[PDB]
């Protein structure tokens, strides 16, 4: 879409934050919006969370203070984008950077308000490849599970997670149960987190249109 | 003693190593008897695959080779103690926090041979805090949910994982079904790998008793 419906669904999302909480704050172009118009409830939060160090800076330019996530007990909502996101508001997560960081973060918001685009809405999740973070000597190992598991995955080169891992994307799976592959893929050991956002998914999605944000609630 | 105990089952465990087979080696003062087991049989074997450093060291003077568990697309046999064994065969480990490697060459292993002197045996597992490895930001998301699952989490102070993370044991609880347990620990992001082998048990349990050593077979 265009920076301008972004930025009306970045200052959507902001309706969702309630005063006296502290805020889960994603990473993206709409993200970044919705930083501009948490800075004008500066007054009213006690701080956020950060899921990016882009982010981190923002919020730090507006003054609002940041939080280490084991600083804080529980956050209002977590407001973030996604790789993708089907009708029973499943997603899929961490084609980017940091996968994990943000999985974590969203697990201690009570609600996640996704500002995905219009272009990540999909019926079965799948198309695009799903990232799987794994423990570096497990790479084979998981890499011969996901193969059984129906994907094709796929070692994400030259690229490592900030907690020193390795990334497998998988391709090719149709992902008609969502919440059993999360499980399925969880319960491989050398596999430390999923982007499969199923069992936890987003509570309300803001879609920018030409005719105004769209508000699906779960 | 004890130790004579762990000695039996140790040396006991070398009837299942077969000639020019890559062995699976877990970490621990039992496991320790196995390996110097093994020696025995340095110039007939072709190496053996690693859960710790602590082992490779030993294997290495020993003059066995140690691959990679990267190297090889599967493993005959895993022979590791664990912390506590149940009747159905399912364990908990990483009491000394060598959880991880312990379980993923587990999961590459065809079949797992438990040694263990009589006192890992028990009824329900649960007794011996569970030992549950978390990345460090997800330290107290993870414990706040391990509480709402029944237990009493506990930060292992001063100990860092071979992978940098952070070690919760969890008290007090009585698992009565270790793998809806597993599966429920394995669903929190924040988690890298949790102590329960109960979706993947012990095939074989080698148990060093007063009367000898008692072989529990799958």
Tied chains: 1, 2.
């Excluded at 804080?72 to 996968?99: C, F, P, R, T, W």
């Excluded at 994400?156 to 998988?170: A, C, E, F, K």
């Excluded at 069992?199 to 803001?206: F, Q």
Aim: with cysteine.
């Amino acid at each position: 879409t265009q920076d301008e419906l972004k930025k009306a669904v970045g200052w959507a999302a902001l309706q969702y934050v309630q005063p006296g909480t502290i805020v889960g704050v994603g990473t993206g172009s709409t993200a970044a919006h919705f930083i501009d118009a948490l800075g004008t409830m500066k007054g009213q939060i006690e701080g956020a969370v950060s899921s990016s160090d882009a982010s981190t800076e923002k919020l730090k330019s507006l003054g609002i203070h940041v939080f280490d996530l084991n600083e804080v007990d529980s956050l209002g909502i977590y407001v973030d984008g996604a790789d993708e996101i089907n009708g029973h508001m499943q997603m899929i997560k961490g084609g980017g950077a940091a996968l994990t960081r943000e999985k974590i973060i969203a697990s201690v918001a009570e609600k996640f308000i996704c500002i995905a685009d219009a272009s990540k809405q999909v019926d079965i999740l799948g198309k695009f490849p799903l990232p799987v973070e794994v423990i570096p000597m497990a790479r084979s190992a998981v890499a011969r599970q996901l193969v059984k598991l129906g994907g094709r995955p796929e070692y994400r080169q030259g690229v490592v997670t900030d907690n020193g891992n390795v990334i497998l994307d998988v391709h090719g799976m149709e992902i008609l149960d969502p919440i059993a592959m999360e499980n399925a893929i969880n319960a491989i050991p050398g596999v430390v987190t999923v982007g499969l956002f199923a069992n936890r998914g987003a509570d309300v999605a803001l879609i920018g249109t030409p005719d105004g944000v769209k508000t699906i609630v779960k």
